[PDB]
Amino acid sequence: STAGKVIKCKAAVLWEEKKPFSIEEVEVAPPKAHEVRIKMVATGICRSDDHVVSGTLVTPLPVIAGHEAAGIVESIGEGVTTVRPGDKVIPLFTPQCGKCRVCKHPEGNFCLKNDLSMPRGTMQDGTSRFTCRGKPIHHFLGTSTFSQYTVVDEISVAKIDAASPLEKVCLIGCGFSTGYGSAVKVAKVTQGSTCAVFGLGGVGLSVIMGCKAAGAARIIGVDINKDKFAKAKEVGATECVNPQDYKKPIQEVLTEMSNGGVDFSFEVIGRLDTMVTALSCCQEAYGVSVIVGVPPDSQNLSMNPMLLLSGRTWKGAIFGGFKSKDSVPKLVADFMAKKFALDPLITHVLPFEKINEGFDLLRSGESIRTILTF
Amino acid sequence: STAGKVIKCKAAVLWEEKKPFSIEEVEVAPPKAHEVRIKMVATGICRSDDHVVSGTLVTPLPVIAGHEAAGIVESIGEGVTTVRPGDKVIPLFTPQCGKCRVCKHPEGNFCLKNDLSMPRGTMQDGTSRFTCRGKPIHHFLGTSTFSQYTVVDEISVAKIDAASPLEKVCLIGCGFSTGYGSAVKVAKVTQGSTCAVFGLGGVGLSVIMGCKAAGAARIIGVDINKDKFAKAKEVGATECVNPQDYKKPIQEVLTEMSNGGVDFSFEVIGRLDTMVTALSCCQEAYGVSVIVGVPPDSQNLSMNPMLLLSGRTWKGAIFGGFKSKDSVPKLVADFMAKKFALDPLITHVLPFEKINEGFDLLRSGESIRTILTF
Ligand SMILES: c1cnc2c(c1)ccc1cccnc12
Ligand SMILES: c1cnc2c(c1)ccc1cccnc12
Ligand SMILES: [Zn+2]
Ligand SMILES: [Zn+2]
Ligand SMILES: [Zn+2]
Ligand SMILES: [Zn+2]
């Protein structure tokens, strides 16, 4: 009885940069062909959502942001074959069209239909399904999860276990999948290995979890905030190191600790200096360093390529290297089959309308993950 | 007959940097425990030998350089189990001790016993087997091939097919294996793939031969010297590009030519600008870019880490990523089996005593590869 009609609901609109989100009444158009309308149940607050606020992630405004979420299908446009009204679903901020050279590639996952490279802030057909008092509002990464209802292209949604707790599995829409995949899928951490993780927020913890799932012998957490350590240890970290405690450069400390360099290093914080450090502390002949985080923005790092000529590998990925529509449901199935825990990452839960408070907790560092409930 | 005794012979001694090599009468001590004295039959002139001349590659002087060679064992010290007097051998500038964390690693080849990282210019025991007028002369990379006779540690030598033409296979000691391995072993070039090779001197052509051995559909040669193109095409290149013919940046041209980026790219000339270019032109989601050459010395490159966050892999290696003692014999086996040709690389052949002439040909760029014959 809302199918095929406009829905009136609340969303969190960013009218301008460096402003709070504004709770507005919006009109959400019904789904056109190959589009899916979703009732949001929960959405996480991610660093990249805050980058939209600070102009760091350039995307058209005004916008409904949000990209880490889970909800329930309310209706499907014509042609949709992969989800039905009633299904529990996760929006995919990286799509899997299944047709482009990337989706066809055994390794690649950055589907060329993404809206991240050159953001249009629209549906795939170049239009928006959102208005706020007749004014068009842009989409974000084809997801736009800071709304009671959103419409997504079918390539940007996956059906998940009908019995999953959406307030938890929403993490699989970004933060968890991104860290966990980095270890398990991008670095392909091996049993017995020594790992180093730079950044112990939610994505870092997710990397640690992946390293533990992979059977790593040592997982060295690195952060200047020592209050992040207990939780890191709790999810699998063997040791934690605070660089401010040391007189000598941190890769030197990590090289000594690992008897000549770690097997896998991960930079989660998104900082140009720790990126080079992280490459450097991995073992010169067969070390792997993986980039996870976006920097505060643009600007080159400076780096000596002899770090690579000995044998090091340097790489990065989006969404932990996972092909989005194939992987998300199995990640959920694994969580349901108890192969990993999500509770440790969730430190704050708030009603959707206290969104701005949620961003305050992110910006101050007090939160690991805030989930907003609808 | 000379076994257990000092041999008087000639060598090319570099007494000082930026000097020409000096043909001197030297004394070559007999091999101690686990050492092997070799009569040299051929040695190539490699770019890294010239880096020793310019003070670019810092190693103790005075020195006997040379590291790409083949010859015959004239005697063995006690313990030597892997070669016998009379065996055709290739010295291994990257050793394979078989015992360190690296030789144990199924991907590493940069054996920790190497003398490249922190050059001592000695045998493994911290001594020299070379004197000139009683004065000690340093070794180089445990190989010192610019001598009628050398002594090397057993870890730095490999027995090869007794019917090998040593004037040809000597290229397996560095230049060929380095390029070819970069394609075959380091990048793991795949069938149907599109490859770009920056620099078409000898090591670049060896990359091209590797890409073709791996079954690439497209091999794009890139050099500012168009005179290098015919040989490039002759060993497997499908097209050649000279950046100076173009008005736009060469990675744009290569991205457009490859419909959105190459699968595998290789920087073979060792320049910082081409490194970034090479990386950039590879496909953003699953592209792999391999660094083969040593910069003109230090200088950091400047690079935007967003190039990696989309999914790019950036890596380097020494000696084409080959475990040296295991691999050198099989490469000769394959050459003997006619699985690849070495003649297209051999552009000049000179007697050992014209060493300086050979370096002039290298430095001017008239040579692909000069082989010196004893
Ligand atoms: C779009 C959305 N979220 C992300 C990115 C891009 C890139 C990096 C990243 C790292 C951690 C958490 N989320 C993101
Ligand atoms: C020792 C000897 N030869 C080399 C190196 C080190 C490093 C790089 C390289 C690249 C091309 C050819 N030779 C070498
Ligand atoms: Zn796709
Ligand atoms: Zn995110
Ligand atoms: Zn070793
Ligand atoms: Zn060499």
Swiss-Prot record, chains A, B:
Protein name per Swiss-Prot or TrEMBL: Alcohol dehydrogenase E chain
Swiss-Prot/TrEMBL cofactor(s): Zn(2+)
N-acetylserine carried by residues: S1
Pfam families named among the record's database cross-references: ADH_N, ADH_zinc_N
Annotated compartments: Cytoplasm
GO CC annotations on file: cytosol
UniProt keywords, alphabetically: Acetylation, Cytoplasm, Metal-binding, NAD, Oxidoreductase, Zinc
Binding site for Zn(2+) 1: C46, S48, H67, C174
Keyword field contains Zinc: yes
Native source organism of the sequence: Equus caballus (Horse)
Catalytic activity: a primary alcohol + NAD(+) = an aldehyde + NADH + H(+); a secondary alcohol + NAD(+) = a ketone + NADH + H(+)
Keyword Cytoplasm: yes
Positions that bind NAD(+): S48, G199, L200, G201, G202, V203, G204, D223, K228, V292, G293, V294, F319, R369
